[PDB]
Ligand binder design. Sequence first.
Ligand SMILES: [Mg+2]
Ligand SMILES: [Mg+2]
Ligand SMILES: [Mg+2]
Ligand SMILES: [Mg+2]
Lengths: 382, 379, 379, 382
Amino acid sequence: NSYIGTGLDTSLENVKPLPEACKRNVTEFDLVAYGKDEFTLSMEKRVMARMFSAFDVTQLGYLEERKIEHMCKYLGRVMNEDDVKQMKSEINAIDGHITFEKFWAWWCSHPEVPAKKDFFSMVSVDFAVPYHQQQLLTRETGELYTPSYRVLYYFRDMETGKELQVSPWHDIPLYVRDLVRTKPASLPMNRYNFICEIPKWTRAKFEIATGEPFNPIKQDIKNGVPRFYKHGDMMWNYGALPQTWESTDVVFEGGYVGDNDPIDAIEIGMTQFKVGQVGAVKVLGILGMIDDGQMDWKVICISHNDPICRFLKDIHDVPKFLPGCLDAIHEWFRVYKICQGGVENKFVFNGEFKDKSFAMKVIDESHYMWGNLRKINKKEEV
Amino acid sequence: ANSYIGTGLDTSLENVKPLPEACKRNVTEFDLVAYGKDEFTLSMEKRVMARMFSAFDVTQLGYLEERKIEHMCKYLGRVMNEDDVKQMKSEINAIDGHITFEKFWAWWCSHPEVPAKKDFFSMVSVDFAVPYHQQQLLTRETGELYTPSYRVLYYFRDMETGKELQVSPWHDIPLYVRDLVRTKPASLPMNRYNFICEIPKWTRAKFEIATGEPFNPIKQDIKNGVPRFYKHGDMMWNYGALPQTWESTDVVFEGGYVGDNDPIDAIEIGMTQFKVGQVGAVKVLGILGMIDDGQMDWKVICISHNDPICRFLKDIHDVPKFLPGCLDAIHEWFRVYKICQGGVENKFVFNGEFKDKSFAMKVIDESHYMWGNLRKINK
Amino acid sequence: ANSYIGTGLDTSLENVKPLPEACKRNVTEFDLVAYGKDEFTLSMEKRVMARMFSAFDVTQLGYLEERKIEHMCKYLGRVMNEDDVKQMKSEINAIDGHITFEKFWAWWCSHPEVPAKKDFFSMVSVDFAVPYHQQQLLTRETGELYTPSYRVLYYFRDMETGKELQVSPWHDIPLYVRDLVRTKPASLPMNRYNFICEIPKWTRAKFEIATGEPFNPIKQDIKNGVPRFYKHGDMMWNYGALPQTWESTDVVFEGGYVGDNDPIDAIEIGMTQFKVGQVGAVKVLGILGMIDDGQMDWKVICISHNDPICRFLKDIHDVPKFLPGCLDAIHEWFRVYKICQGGVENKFVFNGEFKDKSFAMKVIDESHYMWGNLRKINK
Amino acid sequence: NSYIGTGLDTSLENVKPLPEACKRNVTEFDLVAYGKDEFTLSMEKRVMARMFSAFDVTQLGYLEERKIEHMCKYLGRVMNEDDVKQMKSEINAIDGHITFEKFWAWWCSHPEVPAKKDFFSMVSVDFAVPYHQQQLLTRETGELYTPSYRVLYYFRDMETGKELQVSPWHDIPLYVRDLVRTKPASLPMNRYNFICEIPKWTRAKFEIATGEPFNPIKQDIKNGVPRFYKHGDMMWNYGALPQTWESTDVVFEGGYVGDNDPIDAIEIGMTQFKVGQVGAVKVLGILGMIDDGQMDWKVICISHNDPICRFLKDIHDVPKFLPGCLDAIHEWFRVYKICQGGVENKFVFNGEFKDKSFAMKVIDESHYMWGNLRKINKKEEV
Ligand SMILES: [Mg+2]
Ligand SMILES: [Mg+2]
Ligand SMILES: [Mg+2]
Ligand SMILES: [Mg+2]
């Protein structure tokens, strides 16, 4: 804030502020921004004149018609091949030297074409990338608490409306990706899909049937009697991330001893998911538990739709808004087998909750192994 | 399914006896299985697989044939291959093929099926990847603010190659924010659009998408070298435009008003101020129809998906409940923002009512449709 | 009042001419005064104070007497003392006392009344201070956790003297959280109670207010030196008590159930875990009636005023809308938390329905009332 | 977590963990906490025995009956004058030396009185401090935009229901105080009452009439024409804090040049207050503007009922959740007079927003001067 600038490199010192500003003791910025009146023609002149001198770099007192033409395009005027001619004719400056007065006289007399505006620039990267969006659908079938119970998945082409059964394991994308991401680039990507197997506040077991076609969710029934966590209810939604695989075969050079299931995840928002429900989550960290000698990661995440999600930036924020959460999660997994004759479970990294960068890395390795699990089978049989 | 454990096939209550551990104690068997000590382990399993056996014994004869017994085992989830069935008969000492339950149970409780093997994984997946690389929108300011050199430029950063391109915010930023695989309830209509702030909340300096300039950057309205500002007061909401829309002057509304030639206008009512040119997903709540010099001039009312109360504003009727006075202020600001400069109040269609969301989004498709025709005729 | 500026006294539309600056331009005078340039300064004031003058000129004669002209000036807010009235007449050249408007206006537009003086301030205030010093609740743990030495003690820190006293959480923490001067809408019923967590969310170790111990600290339930824990599973909500309440065994409900002798029970359903003994304001949402060994055992359902969604849960019917599955889980947890140890399910009154808030708070006053009688009989 | 402790100072090393624990490889804590079964009588014995030895400090193999009596009261038993006698009689230990076996034998045989529990400790600081709570009421009267408009205030004794007119200026408490404050002491007090004079998104003027009886709110009407901010609407709720006074008389040694009105306040939540509406706010900072040479503080605060209040801890948090807010507030006050022929306003402290401790201090000085304004008048005339 001070005075109206031209927008080209200049110098303060010898520029005289419009008189109406000085008289009032208000800067020009302030007068044009907040003064209720518009600038007079007298006032615009003194401004355009300063613009003229700016363009007059060789400060010679006039400008060549090629400059006056850039200046015009700089001031916003649409100067086509025709218009430029009309200006020269108007100024009729045989030597092509145009004075300010002659310029200003011409400007004021030709507020250029009205509706000619009807020109719209259409340049565009034209990233013509069309696609039928799918809407995920789930359907239960069978009787709850029996072996027929299954939660099936389908995509609905919201274009054709055709339904197709899909595998929540292979078909639901792991990363939730925007075709054109609008969130600040300064903000890293953290948006994943999560599949609830066991809802918050419940102890009945369910899981993705990795062995059946389309990988529907089934109840864990053994000898015709549904299974349950006897230790107590679960208190967060427990589930899994799609397109991942904790291979029991080490598959790369820093490979661990997976358990052959999609990576496990715990979502800590306030809302209970229903069985097999899918939703976008934000990964906050991870906890490594040992299960029968196998590495059994539990990704800690929170639904993007929870009211506090936006304040939970990493795993250190959880004890700040959900005190007790990470302690209860840790203690619950350490001891859930003891009431069944088992013993406490052990954890890697001293049972500490690793942060999001660490989690996301584990999640990618898991995505990678899921990917290579596809290659081997998807290609060999084919 | 709150009493006893069912088979998963169409049955009947009355004639089924709840397993003895339940009756004696007064606890439904379901409650015993779910919350009692595992001691009601091998017992409740016998009683359930019994009734299940009796189910398959439909001609009620007291035994089952070897093709039934094996469909059950499948049903009880045992993984059997041609091989393992062979064993069963062999193990189940019965040269007539009639297998009682006790024979079955004792054999069931015999080994607990060959768990080793290669352990199978169904890979049947539907197919639907999309070859397109995700782009990260980038905005860059250049020039000097309040002079005609100021422009807010847009780019796409290929999140694949990391290559950048200049794009048009008008033509290239999608209007609908579409998920490749929408997970939110089917039951929940889609409502997610991009919004370009031109005029930030609490400010009064005029900015606009330069529809006539290549790549349509954002410019400040400057006339005769002097920047322009709303004299009525500051805009108290982010004011802007929806991309890929066009209110063509070649179109009239119920009365005799034509479109105004710019992308459609929008007002984002969250609490957060957007920076000039900033883009973000919003939810549409309704629309307000104003007339500007005989032209129809819609202002879509929307709220940032990032706003604390966004999930609670379902339709336009909800705004007065959580943001009292907002709709009145908006109406009044637009009704009179010209009186200070000599003009007169503006008039509205629909008696200045804020039309609901369904009505607004209809208006938006139409605006998206004409934009599309403009694309094709010129393309 | 959207057209022309009114006098503030009972009038009529029809016969009043909108000031000339309005008519010529097409803008109501109200809009000119509120949004046009102050140029419609001295003009619109003349026209308004004119009509006001004509109002007082009720016998419509064209002038007013010196006691009217001075009641107006009062009304137009000029502060006049016996003195200043003297001047007016003196200034207003009129020995008959009949003052036209032009005479008045020219004199009004003459000086703009003696602004100096001592400048007065009305000090009339109602009276109602309260001599009581505010206390800050303090809680202190002592002893060792999971042994019989563990107690959570309570104190009041006088925010005046800074002197501390041991208090009883049961008897001294107020049940109703009352503002000395409630500012929230009168239209909004009062709903703010204190809640004492005994058993934190996600834990299973038994803690209780020691009703038989002096100052009723919080103790862990230990029997025979061994601490006690719910075997069914963890409590998934903060579970506790409301202070200054008593479910006297000397009282029966509709059927034949008597109170259980402890303060009434509560379940706080927010997202945040409370520490053992922690106290906090909650909103009551409803109540669930359970029977425990023939005794009535209410569990008030409440939510921390500090919770993000608290303002959206108005009554018990709202919980399923924002916390789906919560009420079912609560019902089921209490229906069966004894089956694991050999017991049987518990039964409920009202068909296990969660009664609404009005019903619950009624139950709470009654519990507060009996607590009060217990105070007096023993005091 | 390890083994059941006695709760008195001891030593690890030579304490043998219950056999059932060792056999399982589960700690005792884990077995008693999460094991589904209760301890047997055999198991309680071995525990109570360790408790016995604890109390046996002189480790002599038995205890005097005065110890066994403390131990009992320590284990939770109610041992009145009578009960102690009954125990001695039971143990009949002529020398008063009580062995564990004899103790344990006695304990198991007397699970002490049932319903005798009917004893409730009633000790209480008995801070018997009763009071009729008042409910603030407001009523409009007159015609909006005329000189009769006023917003009146009353208290309703919610006991008697009697209504009494009050002064929002003198009667609404400045600090909102809980009789028994339950929020952690570790959390400083920040709860004030605020009176909206000018609602968010409006430009019509209103104010507390410090000159009229009961100090109702009136519209600013001059020459019969209501007044308005011509610069533009206000964008936050603008009002004042009750029981405060920016005296034009300096009143204490670091006294400034007040403007003779209650201190001004700007509440930045999302919700519009109606004229004269009162609500609890949290003070975040303050901005010092000069007005005609007079100090004219503007307290920046936010309603406790706004959804983000709980995340706004001090003035530095505002640019984090409400970017642009402090800039627009600052610029709005700097220039609101320019459109009326005035000039920009100046600020103390370089126009920077001071933090909450600084604000609250200013607010107290203001409360102090309001208080002394009462003394002088409230006493002299009386
Ligand atoms: Mg796993
Ligand atoms: Mg438009
Ligand atoms: Mg109770
Ligand atoms: Mg002030």
